[PDB]
Design a protein around this nucleic acid. Structure first.
Ligand SMILES: [Mg+2]
Ligand SMILES: [Mg+2]
Ligand SMILES: [Mg+2]
Ligand SMILES: [Mg+2]
Ligand SMILES: [Mg+2]
Ligand SMILES: [Mg+2]
Ligand SMILES: [Mg+2]
Ligand SMILES: [Mg+2]
Ligand SMILES: [Mg+2]
Ligand SMILES: [Mg+2]
Ligand SMILES: [Mg+2]
Ligand code: NA
Ligand code: NA
Lengths: 71, 66, 182, 71, 143, 102, 152, 130
RNA sequence: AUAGGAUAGCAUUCGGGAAUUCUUCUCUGCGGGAUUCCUUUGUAUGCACAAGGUGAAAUUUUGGGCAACAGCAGGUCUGUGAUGCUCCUCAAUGUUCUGGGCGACACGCGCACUACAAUGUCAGUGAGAACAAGAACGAACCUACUUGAUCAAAAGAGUGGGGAAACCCCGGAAUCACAUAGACCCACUUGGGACCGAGGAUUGCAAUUAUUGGUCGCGCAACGAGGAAUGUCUCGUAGGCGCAGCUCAUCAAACUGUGCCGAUUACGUCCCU
């Protein structure tokens, strides 16, 4: 019962697009980066954004993903 | 006498009220017996899962498929 | 300097095992000093199979409105019951309890007309405990005999498969009806 | 229905003194059933036997008394 | 000589037990000033005593342990005191012994029972209106 | 010497914290010994009323809560110095009371 | 030996022994010595109005006095209200639900007066009751005798 | 209680025209008498000097006469007035303790007095209402 | 020990005095912490899931509050100085005051409380909660202690304290425990406590059990587990147990909260609704 809503997924896609070089496969360092580079009143929302951002990084390792465009 | 059977897979909850489980059970018999590795479909009441063990009062009846 | 626990500091858990092979993984024989272990045994479906069997017996004595939650009272009743069982049988009362739980439930039942089904080992253990406690409770309702005496009589009879046991009578009737509904 | 006596008689008393010892399991309810006496005087007689070493106290509580024969 | 004293706590429902364990001339364990053997009933004494017997009494050789317990009821206070004593032994060995011995004791405790060192988080669920407790609803009638 | 206690109470947590912090800073500028601030237990005032006017429908309730925050600070200063420290524009809804301890 | 002193431990104070054993020994001492004052109304009243029957033990006043002495030992400065809380019970109200009833203050006042007349209890500084030096000595000596299992 | 049954043991004991069950303990067999409750029975046993652990039916004739004389006139045996069930009789003004048939007779007198005078309690008792 | 079994140790204690030292426990404003994060299975692109791990916490973390758009001739004109239109308006449908009534029953229904007993009822002893409330020079309000007391309870009286983390208060709640060597021993019985009698006290301007405690009687009133039917509920939950607040001069079998003891069963299905 842990689906990521469109708010979280859209924010994670934006984060991956803008800050690809500062992310890795680690949830915790990505969480620190995301707390630095985003504004949100919700700590839990930022945590979910970090989780899906790490998922997106892991996928981007194994080929391109839909909705992410990088140079 | 009761034979011991090993549940090797849960085929799903049967019945209208969902209180019965249809399972595939292998008859745990000694090697060289006719019922060695013999498998049979049985209806089971109570909480059960894979690798549980049953006491078959009869081994000749198979449960109708669902 | 650390020693294996014995129930009520006198009943040894060493060699405690059930003869019923199909119930081997659903009767817990872990050593414990008292039945009381405030654990969350109902969080997952089969987690109650790891609860020590004497504590499961103690939980069965807490049933009516007057008995809901009296777990220390149940532990004391079981302390006296085990002594009475040992005097009756001259066996390890833990082994007698395990054997009674092994023999106290039908292996085949009937469900909705009716078809004969088989009983899961978890339900066999649950039903054995439930029926022995029910028979002991109802036997002591308006009776000179105390609750520990009735519980000891019921457990000893169920351990031997005697028809004098309430649980054995119910199990035999259920199994006979289920053989009729094959 | 049942008629349990509230006082010891000569016959029931020497039955308590001679037959109740060498019982394997001894409780006030059992002795009351065997001797057709009230549980109170059965408990009193069992306590008397216990004082005199005729029987052995096995399990004891404020409300529960379990005795056995001497080895 | 040095003091050699640690303080730990255990919790169970609203019961809080604070155990002060000190290197003394003789082992002495008390709960609210009552020695262990005087604690009633025997079931609750057996619960508290198993903070000693599962690791063995030789690890409490020269330790004086005073456990002050407040809140809760008799069962919850007994469990809190048991947890406080086990955690106090672990903390004393952490402070004044090797990590090997502390780890051996901790693995023994955790193998026997998790709640000897980790508190049970369960708490009473608040009552809601339209209900008589946390969950039972007002009786409904139709005719 | 003599101890002066300021009791800061309010129903707005931000206001009470702001006033307490400002008093702390002002006292630290005066180079006086400070005890506290102590965050006293927060009290909750509860009024639970039926939601409906009249009496129709499912008996649903409203739970209105009012929380009160209290702080205390002890100053080892004369009364004139304490009066100087508390002379600033205080946030609205904050009650500051001055008491001399024995 | 069962009564052997556990190595390096000597003597005994209160809270080291069974509370009931101490109370029974103290009541036995009070009755046997024969100097405690027993009110004549102890043989007629109930110990509290929350009880439905008389105390059923002929030595109930001595037991209550011993229990009150031990309670004053545990809590210096306790008054009759605290002892009423200690000795209270739940009352039967018929077809109405039960409620807790504190013990009758009167018998506790009588017990404190009897203990005072023996020199074991005195008025506390700033209200309440407290043990004297003699009361503390008596309590600890009885605790040791109980630990020794002498009882007389 | 370890005492052999006397040859004069009585299964039915006659006390104030009442059939008292002998198997019961003495205070709980005395409460069988109308006007005597558990508290009063214990107090009467204490005034008569007989042991409350004995059974009735073992009571001898003199013991029964003493018990009856205590129940008839409790004040003569230093039993306090507040312990009695009729402390200032509305017609006579005297303190007494009604026992046996006198309880019913005095209840009849009370009802007839409240009815003849036409008080609300009396007329309600005439109707049988609560 | 009346005999005193089993259950760790081989110098301890004293909330009826000082001195330092400190923050483990308590207090709390803002923070941290958990996310399918990690590993495997079946899915097999993705979206996910199930077991396990890590962990105080493992899946809306747990429990609440909030909660769109459409409607209902749903309730309230008995909340308001919210109101249109209508009715009364000086022997008044306005307003006071006196006395009744809202409570009357051989009746029916809904929701409770107490029970039918020995896993008990009595008498004793022990250890032990949490939300809370307290008054308008003094005086209400809440309390502790003492006394009454050279003799029942409930009372009645003093001296203090508290504006409430300060007094109550170390908050001695009841479930509970007791190797108390206590009474009862299967019976409508020491179960049950309905109904009723007599004394007495208390709140109030005013009280005949229809204010409400307390004492002794009554208990020979049913009730020994409840037909067809039917309610609620999945974990600190049900059930059981008390406590507080609210009503409140006086009176909880109610409600709103609180903590205490603490399970059985399921972790499913669409058979019924
Ligand atoms: Mg019975
Ligand atoms: Mg008590
Ligand atoms: Mg009751
Ligand atoms: Mg009642
Ligand atoms: Mg009740
Ligand atoms: Mg309408
Ligand atoms: Mg009008
Ligand atoms: Mg009980
Ligand atoms: Mg009766
Ligand atoms: Mg009764
Ligand atoms: Mg109401
Ligand atoms: Na309702
Ligand atoms: Na009465």
């Amino acid at each position: 019962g842990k689906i990521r809503t469109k708010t979280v997924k859209r924010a994670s896609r934006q984060v991956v697009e803008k800050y690809y070089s500062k992310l890795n496969f680690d949830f915790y360092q990505n969480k620190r980066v995301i707390m630095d580079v985003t504004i949100a009143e919700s700590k839990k929302l930022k945590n979910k954004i970090a989780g899906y951002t790490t998922h997106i990084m892991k996928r981007l390792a194994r080929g391109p993903v839909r909705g992410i465009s990088l140079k | 006498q009761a034979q011991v059977g090993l549940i090797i897979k849960v085929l799903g909850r049967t019945g209208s009220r969902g209180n019965v489980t249809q399972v595939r059970v292998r008859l745990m018999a000694e090697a060289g017996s006719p019922d060695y590795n013999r498998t049979i479909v049985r209806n089971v009441k109570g909480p059960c899962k894979e690798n549980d063990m049953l006491s078959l009062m009869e081994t000749e009846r198979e449960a109708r498929r669902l | 300097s650390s020693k294996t626990p014995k129930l009520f500091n006198k009943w040894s858990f060493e060699g405690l095992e059930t003869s019923e092979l199909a119930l081997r993984d659903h009767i817990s024989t872990t050593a414990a000093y008292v039945p009381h272990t405030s654990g969350r045994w109902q969080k997952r479906r089969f987690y109650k199979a790891r609860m020590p069997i004497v504590e499961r017996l103690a939980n069965g004595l807490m049933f009516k409105g007057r008995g809901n939650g009296r777990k220390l009272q149940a532990a004391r009743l079981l302390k006296h019951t085990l002594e009475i069982i040992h005097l009756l049988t001259d066996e390890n009362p833990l082994q007698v309890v395990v054997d009674a739980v092994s023999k106290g439930a039908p292996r085949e039942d009937s469900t909705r007309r009716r078809q004969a089904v088989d009983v899961s080992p978890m339900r066999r253990v649950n039903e054995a405990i439930y029926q022995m406690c029910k028979g002991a409770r109802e036997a002591a309702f308006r009776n000179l005999k105390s609750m520990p005496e009735c519980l000891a009589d019921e457990i000893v009879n169920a351990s031997k498969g005697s028809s004098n046991s309430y649980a054995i009578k119910k199990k035999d009737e259920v199994e006979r009806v289920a053989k009729a509904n094959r | 229905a049942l008629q349990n006596a509230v006082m010891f008689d000569k016959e029931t008393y020497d039955k308590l003194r001679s037959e109740v010892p060498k019982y394997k399991l001894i409780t006030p309810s059992i002795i009351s059933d065997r001797l057709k006496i009230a549980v109170s005087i059965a408990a009193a007689g069992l306590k008397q036997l216990c004082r005199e070493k005729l029987i052995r106290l096995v399990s004891c509580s404020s409300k529960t008394r379990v005795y056995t024969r001497i080895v | 000589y040095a003091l050699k004293q640690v303080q730990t706590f255990g919790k169970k429902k609203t019961a809080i037990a604070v155990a002060t364990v000190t290197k003394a001339a003789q082992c002495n364990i008390k709960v609210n000033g009552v020695p262990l053997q005087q604690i009633l009933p025997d079931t609750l004494r057996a619960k508290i005593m198993e903070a000693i017997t599962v690791v063995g009494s030789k690890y409490y050789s020269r330790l004086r342990i005073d456990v002050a317990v407040h809140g809760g009821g008799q069962v919850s206070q007994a469990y809190a005191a048991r947890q406080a004593i086990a955690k106090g032994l672990i903390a004393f060995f952490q402070k004044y012994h090797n990590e090997v011995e502390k780890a051996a004791l901790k693995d023994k405790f955790l193998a026997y029972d998790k709640f000897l060192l980790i508190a049970d988080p369960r708490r009473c669920e608040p009552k809601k209106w339209g209900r008589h407790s946390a969950r039972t609803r007002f009786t409904k009638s139709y005719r | 010497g003599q101890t002066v206690r300021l009791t800061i109470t309010s129903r707005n947590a931000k206001a009470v914290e702001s006033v307490t912090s400002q008093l702390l800073t002002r006292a630290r500028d005066e180079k006086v010994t400070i005890h506290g601030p102590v965050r006293l237990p927060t009290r909750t005032l509860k009024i639970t009323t039926r939601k409906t006017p009249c009496g129709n429908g499912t008996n649903t309730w409203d739970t209105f809560e009012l929380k009160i925050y209290k702080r205390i600070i002890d100053l080892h200063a004369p009364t004139e110095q304490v009066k100087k420290i508390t002379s600033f524009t205080m946030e609205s809804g904050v009650d500051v009371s001055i008491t001399i301890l024995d | 030996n069962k009564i052997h002193r556990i190595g390096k431990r000597k003597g005994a104070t209160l809270k080291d022994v069974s509370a009931w054993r101490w109370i029974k020994t103290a009541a036995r001492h009070f009755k046997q010595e024969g100097k405690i004052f027993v009110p004549n109304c102890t043989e007629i009243m109930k110990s509290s109005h929350g009880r439905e029957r008389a105390p059923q033990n002929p030595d109930w006043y001595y037991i209550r006095c011993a229990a009150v002495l031990r309670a004053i030992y545990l809590r210096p400065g306790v008054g009759y209200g605290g002892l009423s809380k200690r000795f209270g019970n739940k009352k039967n109200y018929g077809s109405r639900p039960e409620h807790t009833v504190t013990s009758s203050t009167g018998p506790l006042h009588w017990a404190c007066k009897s203990l005072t007349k023996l020199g074991l209890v005195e008025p506390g500084a700033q209200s309440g009751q407290r043990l004297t030096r003699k009361g503390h000595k008596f309590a600890d000596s009885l605790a040791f005798q109980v630990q020794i299992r002498k009882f007389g | 209680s370890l005492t052999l049954i006397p040859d004069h043991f009585q299964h039915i004991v006659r006390l104030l025209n009442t059939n008292v069950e002998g198997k019961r303990k003495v205070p709980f067999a005395l409460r069988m008498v109308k006007g005597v409750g558990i508290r009063f029975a214990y107090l009467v046993c204490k005034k008569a000097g007989i042991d409350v652990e004995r059974r009735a039916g073992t009571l001898t004739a003199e013991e029964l006469e003493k018990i009856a004389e205590i129940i008839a006139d409790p004040a003569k045996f230093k039993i306090p007035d507040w312990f009695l069930n009729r402390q200032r009789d509305p017609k006579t003004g005297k303190t007494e303790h009604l026992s046996s048939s006198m309880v019913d007779t005095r209840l009849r007198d009370d009802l007839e007095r409240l009815k003849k005078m036409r008080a609300h309690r009396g007329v309600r008792h005439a109707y049988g209402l609560r």
